Coordinates of C-alpha atoms and ligand atoms in Angstrom, one line a residue:
Chain A
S1 CA 0.0 0.0 0.0
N2 CA 1.1 3.6 -0.4
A3 CA 3.6 4.7 2.3
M4 CA 2.2 8.3 2.3
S5 CA -1.0 10.1 1.2
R6 CA -1.0 13.1 -1.1
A7 CA -1.8 15.2 1.9
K8 CA 1.3 13.9 3.6
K9 CA 3.5 14.7 0.6
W10 CA 2.1 18.2 0.3
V11 CA 2.6 18.8 4.1
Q12 CA 6.2 17.7 3.8
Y13 CA 6.7 20.0 0.8
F14 CA 5.0 22.9 2.7
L15 CA 7.1 22.4 5.8
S16 CA 10.4 22.1 3.9
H17 CA 9.8 25.8 3.1
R18 CA 7.7 27.1 6.0
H19 CA 10.3 25.9 8.5
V20 CA 12.8 28.2 6.8
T21 CA 10.3 31.0 6.9
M22 CA 9.9 30.5 10.6
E23 CA 13.7 30.4 11.2
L24 CA 13.9 33.8 9.4
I25 CA 11.0 35.2 11.4
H26 CA 12.8 34.4 14.7
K27 CA 15.7 36.5 13.6
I28 CA 13.4 39.5 13.5
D29 CA 13.2 41.4 16.8
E30 CA 10.4 43.9 17.7
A31 CA 12.8 46.6 16.9
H32 CA 12.8 45.6 13.2
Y33 CA 9.1 44.8 12.9
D34 CA 8.7 47.9 10.8
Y35 CA 11.9 47.6 8.8
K36 CA 11.6 48.2 5.0
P37 CA 14.3 47.7 2.4
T38 CA 12.8 50.4 0.3
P39 CA 10.4 53.2 0.9
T40 CA 7.7 51.5 -1.1
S41 CA 8.2 48.0 0.3
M42 CA 6.1 46.2 3.0
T43 CA 7.4 46.2 6.5
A44 CA 9.0 43.0 7.7
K45 CA 6.0 42.5 10.0
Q46 CA 3.6 43.1 7.1
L47 CA 5.5 40.7 4.9
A48 CA 5.6 37.9 7.4
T49 CA 2.0 38.4 8.4
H50 CA 0.9 38.3 4.7
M51 CA 2.7 35.0 4.2
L52 CA 1.1 33.3 7.2
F53 CA -2.4 34.6 6.4
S54 CA -2.4 34.2 2.7
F55 CA -1.3 30.5 2.9
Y56 CA -3.9 29.8 5.6
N57 CA -6.5 31.1 3.1
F58 CA -5.3 28.9 0.3
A59 CA -5.3 25.8 2.5
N60 CA -8.7 26.8 4.1
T61 CA -10.2 27.2 0.6
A62 CA -8.6 24.0 -0.7
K63 CA -9.7 21.9 2.2
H64 CA -13.3 23.0 2.0
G65 CA -13.3 23.3 -1.8
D66 CA -14.9 26.7 -1.2
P67 CA -13.6 29.7 -3.2
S68 CA -15.6 32.2 -1.1
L69 CA -13.3 31.4 1.9
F70 CA -10.3 32.7 0.0
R71 CA -10.5 36.4 0.6
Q72 CA -12.2 36.1 4.0
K73 CA -10.4 38.6 6.2
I74 CA -8.4 37.3 9.1
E75 CA -8.5 39.3 12.3
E76 CA -5.8 38.3 14.7
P77 CA -4.8 40.2 17.9
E78 CA -1.6 38.3 18.4
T79 CA 1.0 41.1 17.7
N80 CA 4.0 38.9 18.5
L81 CA 5.2 37.6 15.1
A82 CA 6.8 34.4 16.3
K83 CA 3.7 33.2 18.2
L84 CA 1.5 34.2 15.3
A85 CA 3.8 32.2 13.0
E86 CA 3.7 29.0 15.0
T87 CA -0.1 29.3 15.5
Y88 CA -0.9 29.7 11.8
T89 CA 1.7 27.2 10.6
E90 CA 0.0 24.6 12.8
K91 CA -3.5 25.6 11.5
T92 CA -2.3 25.5 7.9
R93 CA -0.5 22.1 8.5
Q94 CA -3.7 20.6 9.9
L95 CA -6.0 21.8 7.2
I96 CA -3.8 20.2 4.5
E97 CA -3.2 17.0 6.5
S98 CA -7.0 16.5 6.8
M99 CA -7.5 16.3 3.0
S100 CA -8.3 13.1 1.1
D101 CA -6.5 12.3 -2.2
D102 CA -9.5 13.0 -4.3
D103 CA -9.8 16.5 -2.8
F104 CA -6.6 17.3 -4.6
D105 CA -8.4 16.6 -7.9
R106 CA -11.5 18.7 -7.1
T107 CA -11.9 21.7 -9.5
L108 CA -12.1 25.1 -8.0
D109 CA -14.2 27.9 -9.6
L110 CA -11.9 30.9 -9.2
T111 CA -12.9 33.0 -12.2
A112 CA -14.1 35.7 -9.9
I113 CA -10.6 35.9 -8.4
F114 CA -8.0 34.5 -10.8
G115 CA -10.3 34.7 -13.7
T116 CA -10.0 31.0 -14.2
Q117 CA -10.9 27.5 -13.0
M118 CA -8.2 25.3 -11.5
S119 CA -7.5 22.0 -9.9
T120 CA -7.0 22.0 -6.1
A121 CA -3.5 20.8 -6.7
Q122 CA -2.6 23.6 -9.1
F123 CA -4.1 26.0 -6.6
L124 CA -1.9 24.6 -3.8
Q125 CA 1.1 24.8 -6.1
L126 CA 0.2 28.5 -6.5
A127 CA 0.2 28.9 -2.7
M128 CA 3.6 27.3 -2.5
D129 CA 4.9 29.5 -5.3
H130 CA 3.6 32.5 -3.3
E131 CA 5.3 31.4 -0.1
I132 CA 8.6 30.7 -1.8
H133 CA 8.4 34.0 -3.6
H134 CA 7.9 36.0 -0.4
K135 CA 10.4 33.9 1.5
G136 CA 12.9 35.0 -1.1
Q137 CA 12.1 38.6 -0.2
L138 CA 12.3 37.9 3.5
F139 CA 15.9 36.8 2.9
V140 CA 16.7 40.2 1.6
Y141 CA 15.0 41.9 4.5
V142 CA 16.8 39.8 7.1
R143 CA 20.3 40.5 5.6
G144 CA 19.3 44.1 5.4
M145 CA 18.8 44.1 9.2
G146 CA 22.3 42.8 9.5
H147 CA 21.9 39.0 9.9
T148 CA 24.5 37.1 7.9
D149 CA 24.2 33.5 9.0
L150 CA 21.1 32.4 7.0
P151 CA 19.6 29.0 6.5
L152 CA 19.4 27.3 3.1
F153 CA 16.3 28.6 1.4
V154 CA 14.7 25.1 1.7
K155 CA 15.1 22.3 4.3
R156 CA 16.3 18.9 3.2
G157 CA 13.1 17.7 4.9
Chain B
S1 CA 3.6 9.6 -27.3
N2 CA 3.3 11.5 -24.0
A3 CA -0.3 11.3 -22.8
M4 CA 0.3 13.9 -20.1
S5 CA 2.4 16.3 -22.1
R6 CA 4.6 16.5 -19.1
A7 CA 7.2 18.5 -20.8
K8 CA 4.7 20.9 -22.2
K9 CA 3.1 21.4 -18.7
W10 CA 6.6 22.0 -17.1
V11 CA 7.4 24.4 -19.9
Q12 CA 4.3 26.4 -19.2
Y13 CA 5.0 26.3 -15.5
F14 CA 8.6 27.4 -16.2
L15 CA 7.5 30.3 -18.4
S16 CA 4.8 31.5 -16.1
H17 CA 7.7 32.5 -13.8
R18 CA 10.6 33.1 -16.1
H19 CA 8.6 35.6 -18.2
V20 CA 8.2 37.7 -15.0
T21 CA 11.9 37.3 -14.4
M22 CA 12.6 38.7 -17.8
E23 CA 10.3 41.6 -17.4
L24 CA 12.2 42.5 -14.2
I25 CA 15.5 42.1 -15.9
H26 CA 14.5 44.6 -18.6
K27 CA 13.9 47.2 -15.9
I28 CA 17.6 47.0 -14.9
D29 CA 19.8 49.4 -16.9
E30 CA 23.6 49.1 -17.1
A31 CA 23.9 51.8 -14.5
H32 CA 22.3 49.4 -11.9
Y33 CA 24.0 46.2 -13.0
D34 CA 26.1 46.4 -9.8
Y35 CA 23.4 47.5 -7.5
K36 CA 23.2 45.7 -4.1
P37 CA 20.4 46.1 -1.5
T38 CA 23.0 45.3 1.2
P39 CA 26.8 45.2 1.4
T40 CA 26.8 41.4 1.6
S41 CA 24.2 40.8 -1.2
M42 CA 24.9 39.7 -4.8
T43 CA 24.8 42.5 -7.4
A44 CA 21.7 42.7 -9.6
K45 CA 23.8 41.3 -12.5
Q46 CA 25.2 38.5 -10.4
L47 CA 21.7 37.6 -9.2
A48 CA 20.1 37.6 -12.6
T49 CA 23.0 35.7 -14.1
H50 CA 22.9 33.1 -11.4
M51 CA 19.2 32.4 -12.1
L52 CA 19.7 32.0 -15.8
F53 CA 22.7 29.7 -15.5
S54 CA 21.6 27.7 -12.5
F55 CA 18.3 26.8 -14.2
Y56 CA 20.0 25.9 -17.4
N57 CA 22.1 23.5 -15.5
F58 CA 19.1 21.9 -13.8
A59 CA 17.4 21.4 -17.2
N60 CA 20.6 20.3 -18.9
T61 CA 21.1 17.7 -16.2
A62 CA 17.5 16.6 -16.2
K63 CA 17.3 16.3 -20.0
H64 CA 20.4 14.1 -20.2
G65 CA 19.8 12.3 -16.9
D66 CA 23.5 13.1 -16.1
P67 CA 24.3 14.5 -12.7
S68 CA 27.9 15.4 -13.7
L69 CA 26.5 18.2 -16.0
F70 CA 25.0 20.0 -13.0
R71 CA 28.1 21.9 -11.8
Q72 CA 29.6 22.3 -15.2
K73 CA 30.9 25.9 -15.4
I74 CA 29.1 28.1 -17.9
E75 CA 31.4 30.6 -19.6
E76 CA 29.5 33.3 -21.5
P77 CA 30.9 36.6 -23.0
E78 CA 27.5 38.2 -23.5
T79 CA 27.7 41.0 -20.9
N80 CA 24.3 42.5 -21.8
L81 CA 21.9 41.0 -19.3
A82 CA 18.8 41.2 -21.4
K83 CA 20.3 39.4 -24.4
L84 CA 21.9 36.8 -22.1
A85 CA 18.4 36.4 -20.5
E86 CA 16.6 35.7 -23.8
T87 CA 19.4 33.4 -25.0
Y88 CA 19.4 31.1 -21.9
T89 CA 15.6 31.2 -21.5
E90 CA 15.3 29.8 -25.0
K91 CA 18.0 27.2 -24.4
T92 CA 16.4 26.2 -21.1
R93 CA 12.9 26.0 -22.7
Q94 CA 14.2 23.8 -25.5
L95 CA 15.9 21.3 -23.2
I96 CA 12.7 20.8 -21.2
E97 CA 10.5 20.6 -24.2
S98 CA 12.6 17.8 -25.7
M99 CA 12.0 15.5 -22.8
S100 CA 9.7 12.4 -22.9
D101 CA 7.3 11.6 -20.1
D102 CA 9.4 8.8 -18.8
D103 CA 12.4 11.1 -18.4
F104 CA 10.5 12.8 -15.7
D105 CA 10.4 9.5 -13.7
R106 CA 14.1 8.8 -14.1
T107 CA 16.0 8.7 -10.9
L108 CA 19.0 11.0 -10.5
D109 CA 22.0 10.0 -8.3
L110 CA 22.8 13.3 -6.6
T111 CA 24.3 12.2 -3.3
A112 CA 27.6 13.8 -4.3
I113 CA 25.7 17.1 -4.6
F114 CA 22.5 17.2 -2.5
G115 CA 23.5 14.1 -0.6
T116 CA 20.5 12.2 -1.9
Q117 CA 18.8 10.5 -4.8
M118 CA 15.8 12.1 -6.4
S119 CA 13.3 11.7 -9.3
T120 CA 13.8 14.0 -12.2
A121 CA 10.5 15.7 -11.4
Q122 CA 11.5 16.5 -7.8
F123 CA 14.8 17.8 -9.2
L124 CA 12.9 20.1 -11.6
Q125 CA 10.6 21.2 -8.8
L126 CA 13.7 22.2 -6.9
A127 CA 14.9 24.2 -9.9
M128 CA 11.5 26.0 -10.0
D129 CA 11.6 26.7 -6.2
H130 CA 15.1 28.1 -6.8
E131 CA 13.9 30.4 -9.6
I132 CA 10.9 31.5 -7.6
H133 CA 13.1 32.1 -4.6
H134 CA 15.5 34.4 -6.4
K135 CA 12.8 36.2 -8.4
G136 CA 11.4 37.2 -5.0
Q137 CA 14.7 38.8 -4.2
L138 CA 14.9 40.4 -7.6
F139 CA 11.6 42.1 -6.8
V140 CA 13.3 43.7 -3.8
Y141 CA 16.3 44.8 -5.9
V142 CA 14.2 46.4 -8.6
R143 CA 12.0 48.4 -6.1
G144 CA 15.3 49.5 -4.4
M145 CA 16.5 50.9 -7.8
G146 CA 13.3 53.0 -7.8
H147 CA 10.8 51.1 -10.0
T148 CA 7.3 51.0 -8.6
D149 CA 5.2 49.5 -11.4
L150 CA 6.0 45.8 -11.0
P151 CA 4.4 42.8 -12.7
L152 CA 2.5 40.1 -10.7
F153 CA 5.1 37.7 -9.4
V154 CA 3.6 35.0 -11.8
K155 CA 1.9 35.2 -15.2
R156 CA -1.2 33.0 -15.4
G157 CA -3.3 32.0 -18.4
Ligands
NI1 NI1 1.7 38.3 -1.9
NI2 NI1 20.7 30.2 -5.5

C-alpha cells in the first residue's frame, strides 16, 4: 500500500519551506518589525503576516473546496510575530493534512478571483509559489537588518 | 507519445515564472548592474546571471539524466543581461520541451551534490523553487532601484 498520502506529501513540501520561513521570522526582533528595504516595500511584519495569512486562506479554501473562503479577512490580535507564526503554521498544516487524495483533484471555480478554474493541486502549487516568492524577499529583509548566518532557502526535509 | 504532455506542462510552468523574471531584468539598466540592497548581497547582475545559469544546469542535467553536468561551469561573454536572458531562456525552454514523459520519472543520483537521490521531477521542482526564490529577491532589488510598477510575481493563463 502507499507509504504516504498526497496530503502527507504536500505537508512535507509545505514544511520544507515554511520551516525556513519560521527560522527567518525568529531573527526579526520587535525593533525591526517595521523595517523596510525600500520606501515602497512592505514592513517585515507586514510581509511575514501576509505570508502566514495568505497561505492559511489557500489551505482553508482548498480543504473545503470553497472559493468564497479565499478572501475572508483574518482578524488576529496576536501582535507577536513568532507566536503568530507558530499558530498559523499549525492551523495550515492541519488543514492540509486532513485532506483526502480526491480533494486534490477537485476543481475550484476561481474566475471571480484569478479569472479561471483550476484543480485544487494547481491551486496549492500556487500557494507554494507564493510562499517561496515571499520567503525570497524575506531573505533580503533579514540580511538588510544585518543578519549574515542564514539557513538554506529550503530544508532537506 | 506523452499522454500527459509532461514536458509541455513543465514548460508552461517554467515560463509563467521566467517571463516575469525577464520583465524584471529589462527594468535593470547598465547603471544598476552592480546594485546591491545590502553590502553582503549579490549585485543585480550577479543575481540575474545566477538564475539564468543555474536553471540551465538543472534542465541540462534533467534532460540528459546526467548529474555530472550539474556543476559544469558556464562561460559566457555576453555582458548584456537582457540578451543573455533571452538566450538562456530559450536554451532552457528547448531542453525541457525535448523530454519524454518517462524522463520525468528517471532517478538521479545526486548524493555527491545534494547528498541524496531524487526523481527528475522532484529535481525540476527544486529548480523551480530556486527560480521563484531568487525572483522574489529580484523584486526587492528592482524596487530598491526605484521602479514601482511591477508585474504580478507570476503570469497566469
Ligand atoms: Ni503576496
Ligand atoms: Ni541560488
